[PDB]
Amino acid sequence: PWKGISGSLSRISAGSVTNVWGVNAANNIYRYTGDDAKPWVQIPGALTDIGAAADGTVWGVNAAGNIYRYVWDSNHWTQIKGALKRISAGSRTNVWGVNAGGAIYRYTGDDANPWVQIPGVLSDIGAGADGTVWGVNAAGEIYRYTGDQGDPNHWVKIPGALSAISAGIKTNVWGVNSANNIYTSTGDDKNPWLGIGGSLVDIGAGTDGVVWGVNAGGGIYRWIRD
């Protein structure tokens, strides 16, 4: 079930139990501390979406579409040229975004030439440490990336409808639909989703299995198995 955690957030991303970040409605940025008694520390800056990876990589975008990577020093963030609306970092080497037109981009590893457009149209995306990438489009159709596995069409459609998706590793894929219903991937593409009790508007599914979410009213939860 979900454990309620104090605080208020609008979006959230979890790469591992030790690297969990979110933004609130005012665009303040927070990082989870590891202590549920005082779970959040505000990190300076302003973001509207964030992607945090198991390896410590953190990327964000702001209201204007400006893109940032955390540099783990007193400068805090560095702006990376281009414009994005949503972003997910599975690792240093697997960072993806969606711009305001729905175009899909992948970080090239070159800050001087940082993005290559990957064919397709999405509204949210979730990238993993192992190369896993899932997305959803504005109508809720769900896709898994195949463009690095020889598929000239780049994406395979997986049945169902979701509005937010996260995939920190191949085996930890979660999403929510437009009515806030929570789902997790079964690993069977022909019976792909299990409904999970609860209600969320965004979700972050980590490489080590950690799952965090936020609901419509800004309430924050972590998934508890044991």
Question: What residues numbered 112-141 form the site for its own copies, per CB under 8 A?
Answer: 112-113, 116, 118-119, 130-131
- Select 111 or 216, whichever has its Cβ closest to its own copies: 111
Q: Which does 61 bind (CB under 5 to 8 A by kind): ligand G8Z, its own copies, none?
A: none
| Interface pattern 72-111 for its own copies (x via CB under 8 A) | xxx-x-x-----------xxxxx-----------x-xxxx
Measured distance CA(122)–CA(142) in Å, rounded: 9
| CA 223-178-84 angle, 5° bins | 90
- Tell me: does residue 161 bind ligand G8Z (CB under 6 A): yes
Establish how many alpha carbons lie within 13 A of residue 194's alpha carbon, considering only the half-sphere containing its beta carbon: 9
Three-state DSSP class for residue 79: strand
Measured distance CA(48)–CA(120) in Å, rounded: 23
User: Contact, 84 vs 125, CB < 8 A?
Assistant: no
**Interface size with its own copies, residues (CB under 8 A):** 74
Shortest distance in whole angstroms from residue 221 CB to ligand G8Z: 5
DSSP 72: S
Measured distance CA(216)–CA(202) in Å, rounded: 9
Measured distance CA(95)–CA(89) in Å, rounded: 4
The region of 6-14, 40-48, 81-89, 213-221 touching its own copies under the rule CB under 8 A is 40-48
- Tell me: does residue 7 bind its own copies (CB under 8 A): no
Residues found near ligand G8Z in the complex (CB under 6 A): 1-2, 7-9, 24, 28, 30, 40, 45-47, 62, 66, 68, 77, 82-84, 99, 103, 105, 115, 120-122, 135, 137, 141, 143, 153-155, 160-162, 177, 181, 183, 193, 198-200, 215, 219, 221
